[PDB]
Structure 1
Amino acid sequence: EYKTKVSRNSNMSKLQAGYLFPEIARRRSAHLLKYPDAQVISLGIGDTTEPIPEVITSAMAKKAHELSTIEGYSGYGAEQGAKPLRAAIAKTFYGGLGIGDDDVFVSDGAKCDISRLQVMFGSNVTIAVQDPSYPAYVDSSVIMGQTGQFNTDVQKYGNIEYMRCTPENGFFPDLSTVGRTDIIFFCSPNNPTGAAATREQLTQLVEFAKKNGSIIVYDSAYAMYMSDDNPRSIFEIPGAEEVAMETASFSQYAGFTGVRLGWTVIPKKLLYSDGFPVAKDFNRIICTCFNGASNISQAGALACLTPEGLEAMHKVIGFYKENTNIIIDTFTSLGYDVYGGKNAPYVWVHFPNQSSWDVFAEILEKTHVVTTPGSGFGPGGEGFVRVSAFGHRENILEACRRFKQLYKHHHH
């Protein structure tokens, strides 16, 4: 059996298992072999379920049609994205926050931008993440060589600064206790906890990055779910343009999870220690490692950013926020400490004194409802389960009655 003489990338070897969501997919499949007739409801992966609004799909169809006309055909786009789309994103989301069209970089979504940013930052930076949070910041970090090995004692990669976000701290790190790193990944509203940082917290965040000379990578993918009067962009914090960039996506606003369209904003005043603008290196990465978001996806996003698009998106968002209420009420009425839900389509449920993988296995086993074990998001998620509110209304309602049956004798 022939083998090349190329060594496996030693950063790939560092990873402890596969990406969490494939692991759940595999456990779901195993469950359906065990229970061939089970009506499985997924509240696991944060995947949108409701149709894209027609105003948006019509623009995509019209663009597809135009590609077969002489006047309408277009080929390669500027890798930064169509100017009018960059302009629409700059005005709609950062109007008055001093962001130009040219600070916006359109991508095929936030997961890809995080990895492209990690390529730009390179192997020699250190990172901080919320603990828990979205597994891609850590995993991208390991793959690029920014970490040591996984320590199975603490459930942590070496050299990553994990900032615990717990009910006892209001799901915001105690920054006086957080070590300096080059990069701070900060997601708000947070996946998985649902917690949105207040203006005073984000102010502390920017102050902390400024004294440490760090870069905040701010993930606003769920900002449109905000209910409380908290900032939706890091650039609402004066000083942020010196220490922060932001990544966003239409995945969770327009149901573009399969259509693929996000953006990153890197401000002009964000500079490396030698004065070099970070936006110039990202622009290099985006020109060399990427050939632009799909022309049809970009036509769809442009349609989102119109009175009719914004109205359609708000309505779908409103639907998921009502699902989220149904879920919150269910657990609260069952006597659980339930977190998130207010500002985010995730409910973060406290299952103390159990391993979250066990709670996950139990719920799956007995109710045929898939959830996401907290420990999939880091050692700070242990003791919790994330429940996703994306689903048709009937499925949400049915999941909740299955919860009520499962848990009626736990509480008290």
Structure 2
Amino acid sequence: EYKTKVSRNSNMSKLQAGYLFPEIARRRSAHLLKYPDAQVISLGIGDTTEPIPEVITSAMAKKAHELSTIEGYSGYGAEQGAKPLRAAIAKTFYGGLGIGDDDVFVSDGAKCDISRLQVMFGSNVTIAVQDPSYPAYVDSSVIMGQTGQFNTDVQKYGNIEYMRCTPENGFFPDLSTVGRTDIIFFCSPNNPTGAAATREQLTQLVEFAKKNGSIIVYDSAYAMYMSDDNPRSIFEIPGAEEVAMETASFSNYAGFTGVRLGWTVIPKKLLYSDGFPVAKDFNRIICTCFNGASNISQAGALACLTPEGLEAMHKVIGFYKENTNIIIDTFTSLGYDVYGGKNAPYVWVHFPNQSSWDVFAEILEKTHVVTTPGSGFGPGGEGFVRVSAFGHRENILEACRRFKQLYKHHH
């Protein structure tokens, strides 16, 4: 066979396996070939299942129709997003926190922003992550050349600072043990533990970044699931504006997982060591590497941030929070240590003396329920399994009855 003379990107070779979620999808597909009539219930990837509220879809349908008219047609939009949407985001989520419309950048989702932020930061920064955490932070770091190879003894990539988060520390790292890095990725409520940092803990985090001259990338994608009285935005901590940016999404709030609409906020006072504003470089990246979120998706997001939109999202969130309680009760009554579920739509279940890939396979084989192995979120995830609360009520109820039946005489 012919081969080119182009060298494969050595950062791609570093990656230890495929991305977590497609690999779960692969195993689900294999299972369905093995048992074509299996009634599979999917609680692995956190994919929303309930319809998008009509007030939101009507707005998208209306925009689509307007595109067929002379007066309603629009072409390229500003890569930063429509001004009225940036304004609605700024006031709805950051009103009174000193965030301006120009600090908000509308994206086609938070996953995409994590990678565009990483292009911006470039190959020469070092990163810290919660351990466990959402796998995109680590993988985007490897892709951009910020790391060494995967070390199989400790299950870590070289040159990444993995901050230890455990049941024992309430899933917040001991910052006195964490080494200095350029960037700190911090998710609250955290995926997969469900842990939400308190005001005191976030104050420690900002003080730590300030002393270290670090940039916090704060992921608030589950913040509207907060039940405890904790801050929902990093900008609620005075001084955050000098050290932090925030990324979020409509995915988990309006069921926009397939519609594609999120945002990032980068404050005016966030500067590199030469004084250059970080926001200006992010603007260059989005003007060069992106052409804006879909106009229809933007029209949907605008409808979300109205009294009727917020009421509709609140209801959807409430439904999923009810699902979470069902799942919590099931595993608790079976005698497992169960974490999270209070401030997030998933639960983090401890399975001692088994690898989480083995647990995943066993649950899928015996109950036809898809979960997420905890090791997929980093080495501190080993021995845990994440179970999503996103599903139709009847499916959540059925998955729990399957779990109880399997584990009742054994645990």
Count of aligned pairs: 411
Aligned to 1:256: 256
Preserved CA contact (<8 Å) 1:334 1:411:
no
Output one character per residue of 1:234-275: Cα deviation in whole Å (capped at 9) or x when no partner. Answer: 000000000000000000000000000000000000000000
Equivalent residue for 1:332? Answer: 332
8 A contact 1:186–1:217 mirrored in 2: yes
The CA distance in 1 between the partners of 2:410 and 2:368, in whole Å, is 22
TM-score when normalising by structure 1: 0.99
Q: Distance in 1 between matches of 2:170 and 2:18?
A: 31
CA–CA separation in structure 2 for the residues paired with 1:32 and 1:293: 35
Distance across 1 between alignment mates of 2:76 and 2:70: 15
Q: Distance in 1 between matches of 2:217 and 2:302?
A: 25
Q: Deviations over 1:286-308 (max 9, x none)?
A: 00000000000000000000000
- After superposition, give the CA deviation of every residue in 1:115-163 in whole Å (9 maximum; x if it has no partner): 0000000000000000001000000000000000000110000000001
Q: Is contact 1:80–1:104 with CA below 8 Å preserved after alignment?
A: yes
- Partner of 1:217: helix, strand, or coil? strand
**Structure 1: distance between partners of 2:34 and 2:301:** 42
Whole-Å separation in 1 of the counterparts to 2:239 and 2:72: 43
Distance in structure 1 (CA, Å) of the matches to 2:33 and 2:290: 40
1:359-411 residue CA offsets vs partner (Å, 9 max, x unmatched): 11111111000000000000000010000000000000000000000110x66
Q: CA deviation at 1:37?
A: 1.7
The correspondence of residues 34-53 of structure 1 with structure 2, limited to 5 A, is 34-53=34-53
User: Within the alignment, does 1:160 sit opposite 2:156 as a pair?
Assistant: no
Task: Deviation per CA, 1:43-81: give whole Å up to 9, x if none.
Answer: 000000000000000000000000010010000011000
* Structure 1 residues 177-206: Cα deviation after superposition (integer angstroms, max 9, x where no partner): 000000000000011111101001000000
- For residues 13-62 of structure 1, the C-alpha deviation after alignment (integer angstroms, 9 at most, x for no partner) is 10000001111111111212222221000000000000000000000000
SS at match of 1:24: helix
- Residues 89-119 of structure 1 show CA distances to partners (whole Å, capped at 9, x for unaligned) of 0000000000000000000000000000000
- Separation in 1 of the partners of 2:38 and 2:57? 34
1-side partners of 2:191 and 2:36: how far apart?
32
My pick for the range that moved more, 39-48 or 25-34, is 25-34
For the residues of structure 1 that align with 2:130 and 2:139, how far apart are their CA atoms? 14
* Conserved? CA contact 1:335–1:411, under 8 Å: no
2:243 match: 243
What secondary structure is seen at the aligned counterpart in 2 of 1:49? coil
Query: What is the CA–CA distance in structure 2 between the aligned matches of 1:123 and 1:66, rounded to whole Å?
Result: 43
Structure 1: how far apart are the matches of 2:230 and 2:383? 27
Deviation for aligned residue 1:164:
1.3
Cα distance between partner residues in 2 of 1:280 and 1:264: 13
Contact 1:324 1:346 (8 Å CA) reproduced = yes
- d(CA) in 1 for partners of 2:250 and 2:113? 13
Contact 1:324/1:345, CA 8 A, preserved across alignment: yes
Q: Distance in 2 between matches of 1:320 and 1:281?
A: 38
SS in 2 for 1:33: helix
| Other-structure match for 2:11 | 11
Quick one: distance in 1 between partners of 2:151 and 2:2? 33
C-alpha distance in structure 2 between counterparts of 1:333 and 1:97, whole Å: 42
- Other structure's SS at 1:167 match: coil
Please identify, of 24-33 and 334-343, the stretch whose mean Cα deviation from structure 2 is larger.
24-33
Residue pair 1:110, 1:263 contacting (<8 A) in 2 also: yes
Distance in 1 between residues matched to 2:245 and 2:30, nearest whole Å: 41
Q: Helix, strand or coil: the match of 2:324?
A: helix
Pairwise CA distance, 1:343: 0.2
How well do the aligned residues superpose, as a CA RMSD in angstroms? Answer: 0.7
Partner of 1:273: helix, strand, or coil? coil
Task: Decide which moves more: 165-174 or 31-40.
Answer: 31-40
Distance 1:320 1:150 in 2: 36
Equivalent position SS for 1:184: strand
Deviation readout 1:299-357 (Å, 9 max, x if unpaired):
00000000000000000000000000000000001111100000000100011111111
Give the conservation status (yes or no) of the 8 Å contact 1:103–1:265.
yes
- Which segments of 5 or more consecutive residues in structure 2 lack a partner in the other structure? none
Q: Helix, strand or coil: the match of 1:280? A: helix
Looking at structure 1, the residues matched to 84 and 75 of structure 2 have their Cα atoms a distance apart, in angstroms, of 17
Find the aligned partners of 2:27 and 2:57 in 1 and give their Cα distance.
Answer: 34
Deviations 1:213-244 (A, max 9, x none): 00000000000000000000000000000000
1:316 is aligned to 2:319:
no
Counterpart Cα distance in 1 of 2:377 and 2:168: 18
Q: Distance in 1 between matches of 2:265 and 2:375?
A: 31
Is the Cα–Cα contact under 8 Å of residues 123 and 145 in structure 1 kept in the other structure? yes
In 2, distance between residues paired with 1:386 and 1:267? 33
Distance across 1 between alignment mates of 2:338 and 2:19: 26
Partner Cα distance (2:410, 2:318) in 1: 31
Secondary structure (helix, strand or coil) at the match of 2:168 reads helix
Q: Distance in 1 between matches of 2:285 and 2:38?
A: 47
1: CA distance, partners of 2:383 / 2:165:
13
| Paired residue secondary structure (2:380) | helix
Q: Is the 8 A contact 1:118 1:144 kept in 2?
A: yes
1:109 aligns with 2:109: yes
